[PDB]
Amino acid sequence: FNIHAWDVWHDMISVRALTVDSDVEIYKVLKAMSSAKITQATTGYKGTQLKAMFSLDGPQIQNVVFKPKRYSRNKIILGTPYEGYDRHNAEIAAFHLDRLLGFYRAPPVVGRYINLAAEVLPVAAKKLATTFIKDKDENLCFYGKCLYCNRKEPACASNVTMEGALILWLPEKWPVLKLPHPWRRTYNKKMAKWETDSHYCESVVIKEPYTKGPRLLDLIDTSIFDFLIGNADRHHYEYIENENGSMVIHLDNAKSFGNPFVDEKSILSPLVQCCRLRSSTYNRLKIATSNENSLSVLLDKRLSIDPIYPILTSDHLLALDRRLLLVQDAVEKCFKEKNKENVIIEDHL
Amino acid sequence: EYFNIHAWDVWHDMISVRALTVDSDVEIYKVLKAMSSAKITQATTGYKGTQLKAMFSLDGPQIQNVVFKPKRYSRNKIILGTPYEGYDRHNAEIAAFHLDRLLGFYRAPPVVGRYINLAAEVLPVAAKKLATTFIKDKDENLCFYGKCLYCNRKEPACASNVTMEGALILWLPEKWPVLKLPHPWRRTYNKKMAKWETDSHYCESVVIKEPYTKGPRLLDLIDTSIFDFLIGNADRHHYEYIENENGSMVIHLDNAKSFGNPFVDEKSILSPLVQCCRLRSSTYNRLKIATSNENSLSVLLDKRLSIDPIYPILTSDHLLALDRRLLLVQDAVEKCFKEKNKENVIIEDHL
Numbered sequence: 001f002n003i004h005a006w007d008v009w010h011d012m013i014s015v016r017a018l019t020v021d022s023d024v025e026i027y028k029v030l031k032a033m034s035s036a037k038i039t040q041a042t043t044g045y046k047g048t049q050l051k052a053m054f055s056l057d058g059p060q061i062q063n064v065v066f067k068p069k070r071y072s073r074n075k076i077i078l079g080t081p082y083e084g085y086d087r088h089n090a091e092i093a094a095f096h097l098d099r100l101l102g103f104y105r106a107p108p109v110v111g112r113y114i115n116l117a118a119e120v121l122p123v124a125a126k127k128l129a130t131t132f133i134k135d136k137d138e139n140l141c142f143y144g145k146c147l148y149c150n151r152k153e154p155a156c157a158s159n160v161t162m163e164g165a166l167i168l169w170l171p172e173k174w175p176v177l178k179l180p181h182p183w184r185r186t187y188n189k190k191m192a193k194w195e196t197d198s199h200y201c202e203s204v205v206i207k208e209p210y211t212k213g214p215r216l217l218d219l220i221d222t223s224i225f226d227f228l229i230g231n232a233d234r235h236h237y238e239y240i241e242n243e244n245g246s247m248v249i250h251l252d253n254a255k256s257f258g259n260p261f262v263d264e265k266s267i268l269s270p271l272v273q274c275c276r277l278r279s280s281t282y283n284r285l286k287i288a289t290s291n292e293n294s295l296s297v298l299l300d301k302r303l304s305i306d307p308i309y310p311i312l313t314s315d316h317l318l319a320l321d322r323r324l325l326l327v328q329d330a331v332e333k334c335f336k337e338k339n340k341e342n343v344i345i346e347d348h349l
Numbered sequence: 350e351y352f353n354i355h356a357w358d359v360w361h362d363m364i365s366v367r368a369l370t371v372d373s374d375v376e377i378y379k380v381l382k383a384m385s386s387a388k389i390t391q392a393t394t395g396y397k398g399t400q401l402k403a404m405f406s407l408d409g410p411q412i413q414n415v416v417f418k419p420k421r422y423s424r425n426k427i428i429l430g431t432p433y434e435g436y437d438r439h440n441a442e443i444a445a446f447h448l449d450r451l452l453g454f455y456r457a458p459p460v461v462g463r464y465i466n467l468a469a470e471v472l473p474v475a476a477k478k479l480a481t482t483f484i485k486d487k488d489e490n491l492c493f494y495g496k497c498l499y500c501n502r503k504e505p506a507c508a509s510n511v512t513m514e515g516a517l518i519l520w521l522p523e524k525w526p527v528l529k530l531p532h533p534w535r536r537t538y539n540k541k542m543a544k545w546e547t548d549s550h551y552c553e554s555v556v557i558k559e560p561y562t563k564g565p566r567l568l569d570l571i572d573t574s575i576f577d578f579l580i581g582n583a584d585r586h587h588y589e590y591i592e593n594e595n596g597s598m599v600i601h602l603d604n605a606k607s608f609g610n611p612f613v614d615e616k617s618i619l620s621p622l623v624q625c626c627r628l629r630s631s632t633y634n635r636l637k638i639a640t641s642n643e644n645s646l647s648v649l650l651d652k653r654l655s656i657d658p659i660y661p662i663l664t665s666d667h668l669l670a671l672d673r674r675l676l677l678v679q680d681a682v683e684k685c686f687k688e689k690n691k692e693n694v695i696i697e698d699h700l
């Protein structure tokens with residue numbers, strides 16, 4: 001009667017779902033991530049943020065991405081909509097919100113207290129180990145090898161116990177392709193075209209893969225998801241693809257939950273400028289606003305099972321409820337300027 | 350420790366009004382493995398019913414009751430005399446549960462085989478009403494004959510030394526009560542012939558009276574009649590169902606009077622199908638996939654049976670019987686296609 005969790009993970013993925021509704025199958029995978037022994041550790045691909053790559057033990061080896069804690073739970077991030085380090089607790093909260101809203105497009109994420117001295121250093125590749133230092137309080141830290149990584153901006157533990165989030169790596173059978181987001185930001189003081197031209201969506205639905213198929217409706221789904229969590233940093237979106245279709249996946253959601261008082265409505269630009277919305281998601285949104293329990297109350301009950309809970313402060317939770325109403329206003333405004341029959345699109349996905 | 354779900358909680362949350370079990374092998378294997386290894390905290394037997402059984406309370410955060418049906422025949426015993434004679438076959442409950450999922454009904458509670466050490470697991474926790482029925486046979490095997498209607502000292506269930514083989518059947522939670530109604534196609538259990546045995550137009554009479562005029566009940570009974578025909582269960586004189594606000598469903602409960610004879614096919618069990626010539630659409634779709642797959646129904650069922658602790662479950666004869674009985678079902682429905690058009694035989698109720 002033995003099934004290993006990494007096998008559950010491999011057989012769980014279809015082209016239009018990364019995770020499933022079954023709490024038994026998902027908790028089984030999460031429990032493995034939370035307790036598997038680390039056999040190898042290195043820096044990873046490249047990226048622009050500080051991360052580590054862990055190889056978890058098993059019949060087959062399963063890689064995860066380690067994003068360490070870099071802020072207090074109640075840090076307020078100010079500046080550009082994409083300011084700050086990657087919030088490790090945002091990756092956890094975004095994963096459970098992904099399932100709570102019925103997207104199921106985010107890989108599993110679990111929090112974990114890592115003993116850097118016992119678990120990481122004995123198996124760390126030289127590329128990663130040479131970046132371990134101590135701070136003025138003799139805590140074990142590492143600053144990593146990346147683009148913005150340097151000796152003066154390390155991630156630091158408590159003594160040797162470092163808190164972070166593990167993100168499950170997709171199997172090789174599901175390669176991840178990446179394309180620039182039509183509504184990407186400029187990342188300088190200029191303005192992107194979608195910030196000056198309110199008819200910008202007309203320009204996008206001309207070129208593939210936005211003229212037909214599910215791509216454009218995916219980006220509108222993800223823009224609603226990104227707006228709720230405050231993720232304004234999806235400049236390149238990523239998707240999986242086989243013979244049966246494609247799907248934009250919610251990967252790297254860590255630049256979220258930076259400020260619980262600001263609502264960057266510019267993230268909703270795909271929705272507000274295109275005024276299209278997949279029907280199945282619209283139905284799930286009306287269930288979230290009609291449920292007796294608010295969206296934040298339901299999300300925290302799922303968050304309460306993670307080892308490093310609390311995941312979000314009350315402010316960020318209440319932000320979700322307020323932003324959900326701001327989404328409903330955006331969609332209802334589309335219903336006025338066009339018509340509900342021309343905004344709600346049923347593609348059976 | 351984090352992320353823990355107990356199997357009895359998986360079982361409680363798994364049931365909906367139109368499914369007792371789910372397609373997820375992970376959820377099902379988790380529940381089965383718990384039954385196969387959970388420690389028995391209580392064991393008893395009730396004066397009621399007609400068959401020898403025991404009631405086990407399995408350990409856990411909450412206590413979970415199962416029904417224990419002991420082994421009573423060799424694996425290749427042949428039962429003839431009447432379609433419903435014999436003791437309850439423990440291995441039939443196991444095969445019928447996996448056939449229930451293989452065909453996509455999901456109306457049978459989980460069943461697992463298990464070797465019980467009566468001396469170590471049962472006697473220390475046995476209620477006096479059960480312990481007082483323990484005896485020994487001519488070879489000094491540990492046996493018990495129980496308290497029931499047909500139970501007596503001369504017909505006990507006997508182990509090998511003290512290890513008794515049997516089947517555990519999960520008890521449904523209290524939130525899902527089981528109701529019982531007489532099956533319109535009951536047998537007479539005497540030499541008198543039932544009304545459906547003399548009148549081929551009998552289906553007219555049932556769809557007049559409730560609850561067969563409206564709803565899924567009649568189509569459920571047609572589903573289970575196909576299920577019962579494949580396993581050879583001619584003893585469903587009273588069917589049982591669950592019910593809430595969102596509908597009802599006849600469940601495949603107590604399937605032990607099956608797999609008795611691999612050489613006869615009691616087509617009288619198919620009478621609901623052949624006399625009504627109606628068939629739920631989703632059931633027809635799953636049957637045509639079973640007849641078209643390269644692996645026969647018997648090959649697929651044995652692959653699922655091979656995970657049970659007490660495997661082998663069925664002899665080769667009974668497995669080959671399923672494939673032949675499936676063809677007789679396909680013949681029965683195709684015969685309905687001639688006398689009524691296919692557009693009037695297949696009914697789509699989205700179940």
Ligand SMILES: OC[C@H]1O[C@@H](O[C@@H]2CO[C@@H](OCc3ccccc3)[C@H](O)[C@H]2O)[C@H](O)[C@@H](O)[C@H]1O
Binds near residue numbers: 080085255
């Ligand atoms: O030290 C980390 C640093 O991170 C900054 O976020 C970076 C900014 O650049 C984004 O990538 C922009 C881009 C790259 C390639 C092609 C197109 C666009 C990164 O995703 C993002 O993580 C952050 O703003 C700074 O505050 C600073 O904290």
Ligand SMILES: Nc1ncnc2c1ncn2[C@@H]1O[C@H](CO)[C@@H](O)[C@H]1O
Binds near residue numbers: 065107167169176252
């Ligand atoms: N869990 C993941 N699974 C597969 N590929 C990933 C994952 N996370 C990031 N990537 C990809 O690998 C690189 C790491 O930043 C990027 O190209 C990114 O798209």
Ligand SMILES: Nc1ncnc2c1ncn2[C@@H]1O[C@H](CO)[C@@H](O)[C@H]1O
Binds near residue numbers: 518519527589602603
């Ligand atoms: N798993 C079960 N769950 C609930 N009730 C059952 C179960 N098995 C048998 N019964 C009930 O107990 C009696 C068994 O002979 C019948 O009344 C039947 O409905």
Ligand SMILES: *[C@@H]1O[C@H](CO)[C@@H](O)[C@H](O)[C@H]1NC(C)=O
Binds near residue numbers: 137139159
């Ligand atoms: C934990 O931290 C301090 C240094 O911050 C160290 O002196 C102490 O010994 C550590 N505890 C153990 C058990 O090593």
Ligand SMILES: *[C@@H]1O[C@H](CO)[C@@H](O)[C@H](O)[C@H]1NC(C)=O
Binds near residue numbers: 243
């Ligand atoms: C989807 O594709 C998979 C393989 O990528 C295939 O096995 C399966 O049959 C397809 N699903 C459907 C519903 O056709």
Ligand SMILES: *[C@@H]1O[C@H](CO)[C@@H](O)[C@H](O)[C@H]1NC(C)=O
Binds near residue numbers: 510511
């Ligand atoms: C079964 O039989 C032998 C003697 O017949 C005995 O020694 C053995 O211990 C018995 N098994 C158990 C489990 O007691």
Ligand SMILES: *[C@@H]1O[C@H](CO)[C@@H](O)[C@H](O)[C@H]1NC(C)=O
Binds near residue numbers: 593594595
């Ligand atoms: C019946 O279905 C509704 C909606 O699908 C659900 O809310 C309700 O809980 C179901 N009934 C019961 C008794 O759970």
